[PDB]
């Protein structure tokens, strides 16, 4: 099939190079459009006030000076003469779990893919301890299997998949599981120290034992050497609360003017 | 009741000062913790690699050099001997509609307060002499209503206000999120030097902003209220994916 590939670490990242090579060996056609450098640390929204620069690296690669949402949007609206069937973002050098997903760069690229009517998948690697080469080939192998399964057995396509792969060899993996998002921000206290000049500074400390990381969550599966799969929303409207708020607003109207 | 106020425009912004004064005149207790500069245009994630600095301006005001999420988090984890009942963010100088909400700085503050177990509301002004007094009058009425009539507290209210006088306002309406940028083509132009540049085109031919949306409400001079998610987990799809994953495993 015809696949598009993007990320948020940059076009020169080793994670995006291995992912692309694995797909071509499977018999797919792959185009790549990625940022010129690491974009993590800035806003994810679209640029509308200024024009955007772009240059070509090779016959299959384009470099873009902007956000990862700009990359996917332009590629499907006239930048190229190419009609893909699916969008894949990755592979990230750091995991994306729990309540950190909403502001993730890797996820943002897949989000823009579904807005235009295409199923999308996000893939991350769970590394630890910041000369050991990461197991990128392991994450790539899991990607080519999910894609081939979506081809024959499609999904309702009103959802995107978030995937996290443990940093080990394939022979040590234990299997696949479907999980939910957990929480961690609640159990993070603050700290107080002094700089070399004697001014008070503040740190955000580590997580405590009272965190939501029990059985059923994505945090629990990755610690037991399992691959996590979590379906997430695409529309932030809570429809199951509309009828109640409407009656709540009716009372507010009569109490005022 | 006790209220915690924050924003993303700045601690010296006129929008946050009027909001705070109106709440105190209503009989509530107010404490302000806001960013030091107009940091509208950066990431909203928590800071973990570097320490954060903070200064106390007066009796009820703190200036923080970090994201609006850093403001709310620190204020509820030991910075203050204060136990608020609700968090309010605003008032923003522009609007927040459609698919611009997910990456909004104003919303990010209200989002963090919910993770710590507190109800939150975001307020924005739809600017096309700003009418901040009109938005402030609408805020105090909603706050007082929440005390007597509580909500399931698994949702956040997103509020937008038209830029007119109170005498011209027509009422309140419950809406849903619309859309405007899912059909904007790519345009090709040249810079004064000869290079090639690309613009993202304006709103396309057919957009999703009809009856019921949040765009349509403010265009006809109404106040929009939209309940939004906090947990991005789609529980209504866990059944199909499970069976789908089983067939994936059974492919050897
Ligand atoms: Mn990254
Ligand atoms: Mn702002």
Swiss-Prot record, chain A:
One of its GO terms (cellular component) is cytoplasm. A divalent metal cation binds at residues 8-9, 40, 92. Keywords: Cytoplasm, Hydrolase, Metal-binding, Nucleotide-binding. It holds the Pfam family SurE. Its cofactor is a divalent metal cation. It comes from Xylella fastidiosa (strain 9a5c). One of its GO terms (molecular function) is metal ion binding. Its EC number is 3.1.3.5. Its main location: cytoplasm. Nucleotidase that shows phosphatase activity on nucleoside 5'-monophosphates. Binds 1 divalent metal cation per subunit. It comes from the Bacteria. It catalyses: a ribonucleoside 5'-phosphate + H2O = a ribonucleoside + phosphate. The gene is surE. HAMAP family: SurE. It is an enzyme of class 3 (hydrolase). This is 5'-nucleotidase SurE. Belongs to the SurE nucleotidase family. It is found in: Cytoplasm.
Swiss-Prot record, chain B:
Pfam families: SurE. Belongs to the SurE nucleotidase family. Keywords: Cytoplasm, Hydrolase, Metal-binding, Nucleotide-binding. SUPFAM superfamilies: SurE-like. The keyword Hydrolase applies. It is found in: Cytoplasm. It catalyses: a ribonucleoside 5'-phosphate + H2O = a ribonucleoside + phosphate. GO terms for molecular function: 3'-nucleotidase activity; 5'-nucleotidase activity; exopolyphosphatase activity; identical protein binding; metal ion binding; nucleotide binding. The gene is surE. This is 5'-nucleotidase SurE. One of its GO terms (cellular component) is cytoplasm. A divalent metal cation binds at residues 8-9, 40, 92. Its cofactor is a divalent metal cation. InterPro entries: SurE, SurE-like_Pase/nucleotidase, SurE-like_sf. Nucleotidase that shows phosphatase activity on nucleoside 5'-monophosphates. Its EC number is 3.1.3.5. It comes from the Bacteria. Binds 1 divalent metal cation per subunit.
């Amino acid at each position: 099939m015809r696949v598009l590939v993007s990320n948020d670490d940059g076009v020169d990242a080793p994670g995006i190079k291995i992912l692309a090579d694995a797909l071509r060996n499977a018999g797919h056609e792959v185009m790549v459009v990625a940022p010129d450098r690491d974009r993590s640390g800035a806003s994810n929204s679209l640029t509308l006030d200024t024009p955007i620069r772009a240059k070509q690296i090779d016959m299959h690669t384009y470099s873009v000076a902007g956000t990862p949402t700009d990359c996917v949007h332009l590629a499907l609206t006239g930048l190229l003469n190419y009609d893909p069937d699916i969008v894949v973002s990755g592979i990230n050098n750091t995991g994306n779990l729990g309540d950190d997903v909403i502001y993730s760069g890797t996820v943002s690229a897949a989000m823009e893919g579904r807005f235009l009517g295409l199923p999308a998948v996000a893939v991350s690697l769970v590394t630890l301890y910041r000369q050991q080469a990461p197991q990128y080939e392991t994450a790539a192998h899991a990607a080519i299997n999910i894609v081939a399964q979506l081809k024959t057995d499609p999904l309702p396509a009103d959802t995107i998949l978030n995937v996290n792969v443990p940093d080990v060899t394939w022979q040590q993996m234990r299997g696949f599981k479907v999980t939910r998002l957990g929480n961690r921000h609640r159990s993070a206290p603050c700290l107080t120290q002094t700089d070399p000049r004697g001014h008070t500074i503040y740190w955000i400390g580590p997580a405590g034992p009272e965190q939501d990381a029990g059985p059923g969550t994505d945090f629990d599966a990755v610690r037991n050497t399992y691959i996590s799969i979590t379906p997430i929303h695409v529309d932030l409207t809570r429809y199951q609360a509309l009828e109640n708020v409407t009656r709540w607003t009716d009372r507010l109207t009569a109490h005022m003017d």
